[PDB]
Design a protein around this ligand. Sequence first.
Ligand SMILES: Nc1nc2c(ncn2[C@@H]2O[C@@H]3COP(=O)(O)O[C@H]4[C@@H](O)[C@H](n5cnc6c(=O)[nH]c(N)nc65)O[C@@H]4COP(=O)(O)O[C@H]3[C@H]2O)c(=O)[nH]1
Ligand SMILES: Nc1nc2c(ncn2[C@@H]2O[C@@H]3COP(=O)(O)O[C@H]4[C@@H](O)[C@H](n5cnc6c(=O)[nH]c(N)nc65)O[C@@H]4COP(=O)(O)O[C@H]3[C@H]2O)c(=O)[nH]1
Ligand SMILES: Cc1cc2nc3c(=O)[nH]c(=O)nc-3n(C[C@H](O)[C@H](O)[C@H](O)COP(=O)(O)O)c2cc1C
Ligand SMILES: Cc1cc2nc3c(=O)[nH]c(=O)nc-3n(C[C@H](O)[C@H](O)[C@H](O)COP(=O)(O)O)c2cc1C
Ligand SMILES: [Ca+2]
Ligand SMILES: [Ca+2]
Lengths: 394, 392
Amino acid sequence: MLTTLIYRSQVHPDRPPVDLDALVHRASSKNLPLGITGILLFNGLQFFQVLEGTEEALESLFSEIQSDPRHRDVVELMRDYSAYRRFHGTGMRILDLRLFETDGALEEILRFSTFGVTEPVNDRMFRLLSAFIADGGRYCLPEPLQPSRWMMMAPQHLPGQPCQFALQAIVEPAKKRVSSFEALIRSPTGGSPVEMFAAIAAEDRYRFDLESKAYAFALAGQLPLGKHQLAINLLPGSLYHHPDAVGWLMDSLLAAGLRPDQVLIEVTETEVITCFDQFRKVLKALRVAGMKLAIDDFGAGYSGLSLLTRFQPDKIKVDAELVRDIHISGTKQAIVASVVRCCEDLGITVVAEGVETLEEWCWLQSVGIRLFQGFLFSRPCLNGIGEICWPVAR
Amino acid sequence: MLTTLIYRSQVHPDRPPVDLDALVHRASSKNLPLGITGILLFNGLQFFQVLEGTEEALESLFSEIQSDPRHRDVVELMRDYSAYRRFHGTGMRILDLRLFETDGALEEILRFSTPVNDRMFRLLSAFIADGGRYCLPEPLQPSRWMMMPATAAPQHLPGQPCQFALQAIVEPAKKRVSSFEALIRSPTGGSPVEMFAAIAAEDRYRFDLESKAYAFALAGQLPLGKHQLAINLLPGSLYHHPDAVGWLMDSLLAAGLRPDQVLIEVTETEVITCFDQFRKVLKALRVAGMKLAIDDFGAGYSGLSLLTRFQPDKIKVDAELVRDIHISGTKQAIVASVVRCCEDLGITVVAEGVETLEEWCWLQSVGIRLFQGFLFSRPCLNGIGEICWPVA
Ligand SMILES: Nc1nc2c(ncn2[C@@H]2O[C@@H]3COP(=O)(O)O[C@H]4[C@@H](O)[C@H](n5cnc6c(=O)[nH]c(N)nc65)O[C@@H]4COP(=O)(O)O[C@H]3[C@H]2O)c(=O)[nH]1
Ligand SMILES: Nc1nc2c(ncn2[C@@H]2O[C@@H]3COP(=O)(O)O[C@H]4[C@@H](O)[C@H](n5cnc6c(=O)[nH]c(N)nc65)O[C@@H]4COP(=O)(O)O[C@H]3[C@H]2O)c(=O)[nH]1
Ligand SMILES: Cc1cc2nc3c(=O)[nH]c(=O)nc-3n(C[C@H](O)[C@H](O)[C@H](O)COP(=O)(O)O)c2cc1C
Ligand SMILES: Cc1cc2nc3c(=O)[nH]c(=O)nc-3n(C[C@H](O)[C@H](O)[C@H](O)COP(=O)(O)O)c2cc1C
Ligand SMILES: [Ca+2]
Ligand SMILES: [Ca+2]
């Protein structure tokens, strides 16, 4: 079955320039008997390749290409089924963009290429080609943000309590600064939030979720606290199945020596979406009281920034599924960069969570993320502040 | 109940400089007895104002401000309930941003106000850093444009269980018609709601699919040419007989049309509820060669997570996001982000329900080039309607 594969990559500027002549001669000669067609674009620093052929033949070739030491930062942009070949000729075509001016490159592409009965601008492949020609260095990973240039550098449990809390830090690595702490619920035996809520009767889970926060506020009250935000997770139901849940949280946090502005509530969009008029009453009560709110797991389940027409949170936490393998996904790169920009324009804080690798941290930083949560920096610490690992040079 | 109101605006660059001394002086003197506080930022071309006070007082004030001839392009950025007054003891005060060094303006603000964890402060920072971002350019001012006149030919086609109205999707910068969208009508000329209500509930999926033959027949006889044909389908009507894609393929080819010429429109709200069955339809569409568009993008608040699963050829920005975009900083930020994301992904963006020049101008400023709405073209029963173009 005919398939299209589109990727971008970049060269090593430190090494001798790649023989473009030998590359394209051997490519075109290998591709032809395998039924592989397409075009290669080169701007002096970046490669852009469109590959056409069977799914099995493109998977075999991309594996060899990803593995090729001539280039790095290989980012897949498109991979889908096709009805016709766009490129024709007994081999791989190549354009050195540096030697074309203004729109001569798009002119040479359109010489031998077929884009159907409608205008070429109606083809996604052509639009992706145009975007690389007009502005290719856009998602080119900067040299200081190359992952290869980076490397990475006590408290007891409480079984007597009905619940305990683990703390995970939100960090800003550029200033080596802890931004805030998120409280994660744990069972008396140190079990997960799943295990904890499973032990609670279903009709009592909303009330338990709200009242467990008294133990989170108390813990935060005994810690070197001072002036970091405390994020707590709540179901929206737990907030409005109660006569004054906002006022209850208010009394509970103030008795622990915390401030309204220091406490942030984390809810997801999936949880909120079914009940806007119910939630907007709760958010209003939170705002007036002085408490903050984040939209958590933004990317998982129902997620869109058109949600921001209903209300604007103080913070948006980008889901770990958008963060996962962002270094190779053109789709995830575009989406996260879009979130960063929208929130910057609206004055909404952005946190990327589930950050596990340097490659994730580096690419998230290139698209504008400054606040990070994940195992790479700091793991959740039961009833205390865990150690933070900072990325250092070399 | 305390409320915060934040907006930005632009001066008239060809008119004499307004005495801002007298403006702010009178403002501060009027604001304080009414329980209104805040500040004004000025960079030479743009204003940025924070207003604090009751919902009633700020409503009354902002209404006078919106009608004020001293400025234009008033864009509301924030309106929400507030915990406390950030500018207590300051009815109104102006800061000329050109009179400050790099962090100087922000440090002055903090010395007289009552902080990066505050949304108001972050919005203040954004205007100080890059305030010219959503500043509407001079050639894109609504007053610099005017719509043109011009002839349609609607025709009743008998012996059909349904008819189709055609509305053009246009590119005004090239005065070019991109595509035509087929909108179903009853044999009498009634709405899509009027048509489907006459069909039995369990036969509505089949009817939706089968009716498309009459849309292809229309398109082939209009000569179509190098134009796309957009058709509206329920996802359910696509995974329903086993050969639904193949049926549609046979029907369009017999009409003289090409696969790449036909685009399928499914709404964001209906797709998200059935990813699992839509996936096999997606494979068949791309093997066959037909295109896919996500319609009403934004209406189900799940467009971003949808682009994670699959990438359509086109998205059509919901008419609600287009509505009042000229005064909504929220919608301006959202649409501009969507446009930027789609540009990176190679997805075509079309704005829906474009009714006014104000909408078209601000849509243009955030990157949109394809437009659908009553401003340019109204739906025409079984034919190509007349198209109005904006002229400078
Ligand atoms: N794989 C991976 N995981 C990472 C990484 N960094 C952090 N995590 C983890 O992801 C979870 C936090 O995500 P969440 O969306 O808050 O998801 C949480 C949160 O929703 C939650 N939860 C925690 N406390 C409460 C609570 O008090 N009430 C409610 N309703 N939910 C809670 O239950 C979910 C499961 O939480 P946890 O076991 O505490 O697991 C934590 C955590 O350890 C990473 O780099 N990689
Ligand atoms: N206020 C305003 N409205 C504008 C403007 N421009 C276009 N419209 C209109 O909005 C509708 C097109 O949007 P839609 O989301 O496709 O909404 C359509 C579309 O979803 C639809 N529809 C049409 N044909 C079919 C069909 O064959 N099958 C299915 N399932 N739905 C269809 O039913 C809906 C109702 O369509 P219509 O009566 O044809 O009404 C059209 C149309 O006249 C504008 O500038 N301002
Ligand atoms: C940017 C770039 C594009 C490439 N394109 C192709 C290609 O289209 N076809 C191909 O066979 N090899 C291509 N290669 C080379 C392969 O990665 C790999 O070196 C080659 O398949 C090995 O073949 P050989 O050693 O048997 O000659 C490309 C390499 C780079 C860096
Ligand atoms: C940039 C801008 C900001 C303004 N801010 C205020 C304000 O904060 N308070 C106020 O009373 N008038 C403000 N005005 C003036 C009002 O639009 C309007 O002229 C005034 O409220 C009319 O009331 P008056 O006739 O009693 O002066 C502002 C005008 C402009 C152009
Ligand atoms: Ca959380
Ligand atoms: Ca439609």
